[PDB]
Amino acid sequence: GLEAVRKRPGMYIGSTSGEGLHHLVWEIVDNSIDEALAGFAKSIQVIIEPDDSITVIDDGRGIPVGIQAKTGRPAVETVFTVLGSSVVNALSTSLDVRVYKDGKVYYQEYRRGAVVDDLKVIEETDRHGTTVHFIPDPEIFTETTVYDFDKLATRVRELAFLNRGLHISIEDRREGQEDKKEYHYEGLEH
Numbered sequence: 142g143l144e145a146v147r148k149r150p151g152m153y154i155g156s157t158s159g160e161g162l163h164h165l166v167w168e169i170v171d172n173s174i175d176e177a178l179a180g181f182a183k184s185i186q187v188i189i190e191p192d193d194s195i196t197v198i199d200d201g202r203g204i205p206v207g208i209q210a211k212t213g214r215p216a217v218e219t220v221f222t223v224l225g226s227s228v229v230n231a232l233s234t235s236l237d238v239r240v241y242k243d244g245k246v247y248y249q250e251y252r253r254g255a256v257v258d259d260l261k262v263i264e265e266t267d268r269h270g271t272t273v274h275f276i277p278d279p280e281i282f283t284e285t286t287v288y289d290f291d292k293l294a295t296r297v298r299e300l301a302f303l304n305r306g307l308h309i310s311i312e313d314r315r316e317g318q319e320d321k322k323e324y325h326y327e328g329l330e331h
């Protein structure tokens with residue numbers, strides 16, 4: 142399972158250098174992209190947190206939270222624990238997911254890929270979507286755990302263009318360099 146990912150990360154993310162570090166972002170963002178293609182997500186936020194962790198927020202339907210017959214576990218748990226999203230989980234010190242669905246916020250967290258506790262309703266909400274936050278593991282990313290805002294922004298812009306109509310932003314919250322760029326290419330309303 143994911144134990145193999147932690148021992149051979151090069152086979153799953155291509156490189157454990159800075160390139161692999163950034164690849165984790167795209168693996169998560171690609172899920173939000175898929176939910177935009179499904180027609181439900183309209184906006185995606187990518188945030189570099191002050192500690193070089195990453196938050197990705199979409200306003201889609203939210204990852205399914207029901208128990209799957211095949212696994213006996215909530216669908217959202219399987220997304221992160223069974224071998225892109227599960228690879229990011231495995232290579233992070235911690236990953237937390239919040240699903241905003243049916244007036245509830247469903248929460249689960251993992252540590253170096255391992256489940257902390259069963260999925261739990263933690264809050265009520267009026268919004269919908271999925272928020273994933275992860276802290277890349279320096280035991281894996283031994284060269285660098287520092288994100289490149291311009292590198293992320295460049296690809297986010299490309300992604301906005303390829304997914305015309307999508308709102309996507311990138312934000313840096315790190316000390317002395319706070320920045321944000323927002324992208325949106327218009328559809329037929331142009």
Ligand SMILES: CNc1cc(F)cc2c1[nH]c1nc(Oc3cnc(C)nc3)nc(N3C[C@@H]4[C@H](N)C[C@]4(C)C3)c12
Pocket residue numbers: 169171172173175176197198199201202203204205220226271272273
């Ligand atoms: C930061 N965002 C983020 C991050 C993330 F890691 C996953 C999702 C994610 N956002 C997501 N939104 C949905 O939306 C749905 C809702 N309902 C259904 C039936 N399918 C997709 N599904 C999601 N998933 C992930 C798996 C495939 N892309 C389809 C899934 C089996 C379910 C995500």
